[PDB]
Amino acid sequence: GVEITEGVTVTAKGNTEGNTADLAIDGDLSTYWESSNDYKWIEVDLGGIYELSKIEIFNKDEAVYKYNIYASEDGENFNKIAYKNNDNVSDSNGNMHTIDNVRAGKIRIDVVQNSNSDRVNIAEINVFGKNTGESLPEVKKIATSNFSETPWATEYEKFNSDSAYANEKTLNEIKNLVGRVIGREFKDKFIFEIRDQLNGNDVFEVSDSGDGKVLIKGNNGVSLASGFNYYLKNYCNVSYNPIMGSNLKMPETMPSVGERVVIDTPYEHRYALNFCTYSYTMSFWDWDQYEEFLDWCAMNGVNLVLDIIGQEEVLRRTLNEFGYSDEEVKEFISGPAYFAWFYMQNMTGFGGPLPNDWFEQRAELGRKMHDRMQSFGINPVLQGYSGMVPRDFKEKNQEAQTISQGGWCGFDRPDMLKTYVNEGEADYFQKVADVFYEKQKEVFGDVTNFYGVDPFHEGGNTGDLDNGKIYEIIQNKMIEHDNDAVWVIQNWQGNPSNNKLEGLTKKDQAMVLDLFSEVSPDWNRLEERDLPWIWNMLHNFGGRMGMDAAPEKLATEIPKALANSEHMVGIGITPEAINTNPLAYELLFDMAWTRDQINFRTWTEDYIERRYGKTNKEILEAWNIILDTAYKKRNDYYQGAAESIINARPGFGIKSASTWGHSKIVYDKSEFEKAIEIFAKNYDEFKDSDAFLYDFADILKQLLANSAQEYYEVMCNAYNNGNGEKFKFVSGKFLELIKLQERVLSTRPEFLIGNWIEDARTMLKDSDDWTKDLFEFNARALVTTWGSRNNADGGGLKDYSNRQWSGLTEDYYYARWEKWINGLQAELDGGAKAPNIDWFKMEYDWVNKKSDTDKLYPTEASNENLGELAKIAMESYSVTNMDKI
Numbered sequence: 001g002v003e004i005t006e007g008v009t010v011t012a013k014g015n016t017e018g019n020t021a022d023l024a025i026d027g028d029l030s031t032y033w034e035s036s037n038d039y040k041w042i043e044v045d046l047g048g049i050y051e052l053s054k055i056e057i058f059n060k061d062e063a064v065y066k067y068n069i070y071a072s073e074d075g076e077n078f079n080k081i082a083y084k085n086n087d088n089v090s091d092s093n094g095n096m097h098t099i100d101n102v103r104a105g106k107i108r109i110d111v112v113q114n115s116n117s118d119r120v121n122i123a124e125i126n127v128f129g130k131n132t133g134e135s136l137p138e139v140k141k142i143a144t145s146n147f148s149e150t151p152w153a154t155e156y157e158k159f160n161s162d163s164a165y166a167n168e169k170t171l172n173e174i175k176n177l178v179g180r181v182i183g184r185e186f187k188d189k190f191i192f193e194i195r196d197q198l199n200g201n202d203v204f205e206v207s208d209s210g211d212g213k214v215l216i217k218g219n220n221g222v223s224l225a226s227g228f229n230y231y232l233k234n235y236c237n238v239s240y241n242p243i244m245g246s247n248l249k250m251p252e253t254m255p256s257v258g259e260r261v262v263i264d265t266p267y268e269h270r271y272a273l274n275f276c277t278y279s280y281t282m283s284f285w286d287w288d289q290y291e292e293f294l295d296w297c298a299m300n301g302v303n304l305v306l307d308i309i310g311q312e313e314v315l316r317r318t319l320n321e322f323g324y325s326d327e328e329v330k331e332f333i334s335g336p337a338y339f340a341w342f343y344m345q346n347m348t349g350f351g352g353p354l355p356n357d358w359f360e361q362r363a364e365l366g367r368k369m370h371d372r373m374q375s376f377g378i379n380p381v382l383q384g385y386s387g388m389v390p391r392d393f394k395e396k397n398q399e400a401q402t403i404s405q406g407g408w409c410g411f412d413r414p415d416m417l418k419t420y421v422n423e424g425e426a427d428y429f430q431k432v433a434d435v436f437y438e439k440q441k442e443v444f445g446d447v448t449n450f451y452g453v454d455p456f457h458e459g460g461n462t463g464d465l466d467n468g469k470i471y472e473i474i475q476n477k478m479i480e481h482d483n484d485a486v487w488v489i490q491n492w493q494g495n496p497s498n499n500k501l502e503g504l505t506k507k508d509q510a511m512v513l514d515l516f517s518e519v520s521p522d523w524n525r526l527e528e529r530d531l532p533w534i535w536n537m538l539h540n541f542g543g544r545m546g547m548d549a550a551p552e553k554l555a556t557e558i559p560k561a562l563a564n565s566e567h568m569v570g571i572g573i574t575p576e577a578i579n580t581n582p583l584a585y586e587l588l589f590d591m592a593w594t595r596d597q598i599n600f601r602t603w604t605e606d607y608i609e610r611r612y613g614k615t616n617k618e619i620l621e622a623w624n625i626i627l628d629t630a631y632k633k634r635n636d637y638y639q640g641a642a643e644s645i646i647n648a649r650p651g652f653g654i655k656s657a658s659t660w661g662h663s664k665i666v667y668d669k670s671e672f673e674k675a676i677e678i679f680a681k682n683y684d685e686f687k688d689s690d691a692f693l694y695d696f697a698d699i700l701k702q703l704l705a706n707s708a709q710e711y712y713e714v715m716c717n718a719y720n721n722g723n724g725e726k727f728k729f730v731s732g733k734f735l736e737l738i739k740l741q742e743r744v745l746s747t748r749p750e751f752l753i754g755n756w757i758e759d760a761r762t763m764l765k766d767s768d769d770w771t772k773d774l775f776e777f778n779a780r781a782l783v784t785t786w787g788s789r790n791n792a793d794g795g796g797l798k799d800y801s802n803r804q805w806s807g808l809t810e811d812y813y814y815a816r817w818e819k820w821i822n823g824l825q826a827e828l829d830g831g832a833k834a835p836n837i838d839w840f841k842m843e844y845d846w847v848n849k850k851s852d853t854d855k856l857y858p859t860e861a862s863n864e865n866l867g868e869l870a871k872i873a874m875e876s877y878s879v880t881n882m883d884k885i
């Protein structure tokens with residue numbers, strides 16, 4: 001218990017001018033370290049291993065500070081040993097924390113809240129303990145394997161060079177898929193065969209074997225899985241969706257096929273995934289979830305998938321060759337929930353640093369994916385390189401020429417190397433691009449010909465450079481390292497411009513994803529320039545939820561585009577998240593297997609029967625109401641489902657929760673409520689279908705979101721009219737409506753914030769408390785404030801990824817509205833004017849709470865009766881009966 005007064009040093013990753021880290025341990029209460037960015041922690045080295053008894057912390061003023069304290073005795077694992085989360089003000093006496101004789105050579109103090117400022121500080125920190133005489137071990141540097149040295153390389157080349165081995169692998173893997181999807185007991189009821197393409201097109205066949213088994217042919221694994229899916233949907237009344245609800249009840253005996261079926265697709269590619277999907281949905285996926293997704297992809301005909309798994313190791317090896325240590329690379333790379341905007345060159349650093357063990361684990365996961373994709377015949381889209389470098393690249397490489405890219409939503413964009421330079425100047429685009437493509441091959445090997453990169457995504461700066469020449473040189477460099485390369489390019493709000501695209505000198509080795517074809521198609525300019533392009537349904541923005549789909553456009557515009565074009569080489573999905581409206585994604589991929597328009601109404605009728613395992617006239621009537629309301633074709637511009645007012649920052653005249661969203665309901669709300677009445681009437685009969693319960697919760701929460709918007713307008717009028725008694729009553733029903741909404745959301749495991757957070761905290765094995773807390777920060781921030789203040793507010797990202805989720809609704813959305821309502825009520829009751837609320841401060845307080853110290857959110861759904869909840873909603877919180885209420 002003696003104060004450690006010699007040999008103590010400290011580091012920090014950021015500080016305001018003159019308030020450096022060493023000022024936290026200089027014995028002077030008048031000097032302080034102060035943070036300058038989102039790295040709000042300091043790391044103290046004790047000059048040896050001590051058994052700590054006390055830690056004492058002083059701040060620079062008398063604000064309320066909250067912080068978490070971590071310790072490490074091996075140099076790698078920092079585990080939580082103390083914290084302050086109460087609302088006590090700091091004072092001249094400091095805060096003393098008792099430590100239970102914990103061994104520690106290093107200490108981390110993370111100050112997550114300063115009630116007075118966005119920036120945090122530590123005036124002094126004193127550590128008390130007993131010297132053990134020991135010193136920390138030297139921590140091993142990051143060590144990763146080359147692909148060619150792993151068993152993955154042996155297996156990948158064996159598949160490549162041995163057709164008999166490759167066919168045995170594929171056919172066995174499709175059999176394993178069957179066991180995973182419907183059960184191992186059904187594996188031996190199928191016989192799978194590889195056949196040739198049908199006149200250059202992927203094709204599958206389904207027929208009777210002759211002895212009661214199902215014979216399925218296909219030119220590759222995807223076609224085989226698609227034929228297996230076709231048999232389930234059309235003969236077993238079965239529907240598979242591992243993310244959004246399934247019906248896997250198989251008949252007691254295998255239904256006979258009857259007449260043989262041969263079905264092909266005219267599309268070379270069926271594409272899946274936005275960069276954003278890797279953040280809003282897949283951030284914390286394990287291999288079990290990736291395997292499910294690839295099974296579902298193959299069954300839906302998907303053969304081209306964006307793949308950024310383990311790209312952090314590729315970039316580490318690359319930047320290591322240009323003066324960057326591993327620690328500097330970790331500061332450049334974002335956290336695990338922000339890779340989408342890191343690789344689209346929009347932001348750096350935030351959410352990190354990643355743990356040291358991240359790099360090898362993710363490279364291994366990526367190799368695991370490529371093995372499975374090779375078995376199925378799914379092409380991954382790896383990374384191209386367009387010149388992205390950190391902002392200090394010139395400091396370490398003096399001859400390099402770079403272009404400042406400015407800001408994106410308050411984040412500092414990375415720099416961009418000049419794609420070409422004058423003669424006499426060093427060309428670091430050529431240097432770094434050569435290293436990048438070579439390092440990518442070292443990590444994963446030759447797994448694809450498709451590479452994605454998107455300079456100037458949603459901003460940037462072309463500097464003095466010529467637009468077309470930029471894309472000419474980027475493509476040529478890509479082809480230099482892979483002669484068969486195809487540059488996969490996003491087409492998003494008119495970018496890249498025609499002048500940029502016309503710089504592509506090899507049109508057949510570029511492929512443009514028309515990102516938003518079902519709302520704002522933009523492929524005519526691509527078709528006119530003879531550029532291969534893909535028709536994509538985006539549908540989902542930020543994971544924001546609500547009933548929303550364009551089935552009629554999918555059933556008609558896709559074959560119409562094929563008939564009116566020559567360079568349409570596929571269809572696909574580009575959702576920012578895969579969590580809502582499974583009908584839309586089922587119908588899209590189904591449109592790959594036809595050249596004619598289909599009837600979206602009769603398609604929906606067949607879809608709901610296999611999704612629920614049964615149907616009747618009333619259930620069909622309810623879904624026709626959905627088709628006539630929430631799923632009805634529209635011709636305006638909109639990003640995602642209409643947002644729930646419950647999820648918006650409280651205020652006057654709200655028209656959306658997110659900056660680029662919308663809350664206008666374009667259908668009649670009371671008409672849509674009829675669908676809920678029908679579902680409730682049929683609840684007892686259909687409650688054995690999990691997909692029915694999924695859909696029931698989906699439309700019931702849409703009902704309460706729609707009615708909450710009306711109740712919000714009424715209490716807004718009551719305030720403007722000075723009617724305090726009416727405001728108290730209407731706002732009381734509004735808050736009660738939200739309480740009912742939280743109960744509805746609690747019935748679905750998909751809607752639990754606890755599952756999102758726990759996945760983040762457990763996505764790596766043998767991680768320390770520090771990494772778990774940081775990953776939880778990633779998970780909490782992304783669905784609320786997104787970034788910190790300058791990103792949420794000035795940057796416009798506040799509640800961009802708002803979710804109608806259990807736990808989050810009770811503790812975040814409800815709390816905001818309750819606070820706002822209480823303020824307005826006090827004013828109407830003859831009090832002082834309602835104060836301004838710093839919403840970000842309140843929101844960031846929830847963001848920084850930890851599951852092991854504050855509140856652990858459940859991972860188990862409730863048993864609430866959706867039919868009974870629907871009755872309450874219709875009787876007490878509905879639009880139809882609103883005047884009686």
Ligand SMILES: CC(=O)N[C@@H]1[C@@H](O)[C@H](O)[C@@H](CO)N[C@H]1CO
Pocket residue numbers: 274276492515541542576639660797800
């Ligand atoms: C903050 C954010 O996620 N913004 C997304 C962006 O990341 C995405 O690349 C783009 C195309 O899907 N849509 C933007 C939203 O209009």
Ligand SMILES: [Ca+2]
Pocket residue numbers: 023024025026027028029030031032033122123124
């Ligand atoms: Ca000091």
